[model samples]
Target: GKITFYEDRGFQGHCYECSSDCPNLQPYFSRCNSIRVDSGCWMLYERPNYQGHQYFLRRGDYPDYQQWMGFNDSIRSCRLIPQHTGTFRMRIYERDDFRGQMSEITDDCPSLQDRFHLTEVHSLNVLEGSWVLYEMPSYRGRQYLLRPGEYRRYLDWGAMNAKVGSLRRVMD
Candidate 1:
């Protein structure tokens, strides 16, 4: 997808349009306060080189950083999430390296606590399709994109910790 990052809120100031992974967006502008996703899905990073906190965004307009649940008005990097067409299947684990209690879900999981009686997800196996994992219940908080593969640890998805509250398939 194509994404335009604005240096100021309300979609003003210098803008940088990107359709693929940008390891260092600093050369484009100062900071990103707002954004416009012209097409497809994307993941914005707070630090350069695709490090730090992540924010998942689909096609839409974000007048301000807060709209994407950003912690601040700084976006240093971004990556376009490729769309996939297939059945959705995943197995979330309570411990790292695919160990401990596990719960499989082909649909959406609004609350992992309700299903596993746990709030943390240390590992996961994305068997099919692409998925978005939220750090808060009801699809809130930071987001981590997952493709069809094995994420032996939460960090495999670029998460700071293993605290997944919810998850859903990206049907687009």
Candidate 2:
């Protein structure tokens, strides 16, 4: 996997190339104004050591930080997301630790509120294929990638709160 970060917008100015996790990107560049993902999906963190806010990126060019709904140009760490193949299945819970009302889904859900009668998802279990969770309906706003795993709370996916509006499988 390869990704390039630029300090200036429109892919200009000082840049850094990375193919793996960068725990301390501050030494190479203090801020990342733009990015180009040559191959593979990646998660960019707002702080070092893969902490803080995270943004999921696929193979493409983000001309500016706004394209990813980034709060600022600061990017301190990054990690490549491994591709996975399998059927999509998951259970969303309204409370942490998998408690509260639950709903199981195997396909894309454009509006969790309409389908599950709930607006917040505090926990989830990705039992099958990889998936993407959106903070707003219609797949807008911040997104979090979910592989086959158990997420006891929204923070497990690097979210600051429990507000998920939509979800969809990542078709290979």
Candidate 3:
């Protein structure tokens, strides 16, 4: 079995706060908190930040785990699945603070549009079925920040909340 990866754009979370079993968990803030899981190895979406900089559970433990930089809140996260025979998932965190915090203006809320323009992809062979998480970057020189509580209020399964998908098989 080989490892595979997957990526999703314009993603968002639904939960206001993550439990204690979420992988790559972050600190607790008044703003909404989303989560992403492997759906294979990680069964519990723990509360509190589990896989953040401090813990780095799987990031440091596994060789296939990777977090890509260079984007604002909208980011790309990747992990290797066993023999590329598992499922992959991606989730986007919707926040107002373009810089990774909360804001006051609803329109100013940072979204995947501001950070990840994900127009094209060169390869999907490497990532097939894994959980990817990213935060949209804050817009530069933009005004109208969203308050901590202010959100777009997407539908039940809109951009917010968690998304669990299967890798199925690798292709190339």
Candidate 4:
């Protein structure tokens, strides 16, 4: 998988090409205005060290930051999400520390409230593949990436709150 970041809109000015995860990207270019994803799915971080808001993108050309659902142009880190086979599985909890009511699913959930009545997901276990956590229903609002791991609490996933409205597996 490859991605090219440009310093100006419409693929102009300084650019950087990457094929893997980058923790800090200041050395390659000072700013980024456009991006071309040659292949693979990508999770972009607003701040360095993969912190701050996250935006997911697949193979496409983003002529401007808005195309990728970005409100700013400061993309300092990115992760190339690996393709997953087999099945995508995840378990959510109503209480923290993996406790309380439990439910598991292998497919996308657009309305967690309607299905499970979970107003806020306190914990998550990504048992198989990567996933996307949307703050609002219908895959809208703030987003967070969930790599295969354990999140004992909502804070473990870097969310401002436990308010998750939807969940979807990242497939490329």
List the candidate 2 regions with Cα displacement exceeding 4 Å. none
The reply for model 3, stretches above 4 Å from the true place, is 1-43, 46-128, 137-172
**Candidate 3 structure quality by residue, lDDT tens digits, 64-135:** 222322112211222223323333322223332222332121112234343344311111211223222222
Q: Give the TM-score of candidate 4.
A: 0.94
Which pairs of residues have clashing backbones in candidate 4? Answer: none
RMSD of each predicted structure = 1.6, 1.9, 16.8, 1.2
lDDT of 2 by residue, 95-114 (tens): 99999888899999999888
For model 2, the run of ten residues with the poorest summed lDDT: 79-88
What's the lDDT for candidate 1? 0.86
Q: What lDDT tens digits, residue by residue, belong to model 1 across residues 1-172?
A: 7889998999999898888889988988889888998898787888898888888888899999889999998889887776766568999887889998788889888988887788898889999878889998988998888888999988899888889898978754
- State TM-scores per candidate: 0.90, 0.88, 0.19, 0.94
**What are the clashing pairs of model 1?**
none
TM-score ranking, best first: 4, 1, 2, 3
Model 3 per-residue lDDT at 144: 15
The better candidate by TM-score, 1 or 2, is 1
Give the per-residue lDDT digits (tens) of candidate 4, residues 89-162. Answer: 99998898989888998999999988888779999899999999999898888889999899999988889899
How many clashing pairs in candidate 2?
0
lDDT of each: 0.86, 0.86, 0.24, 0.91
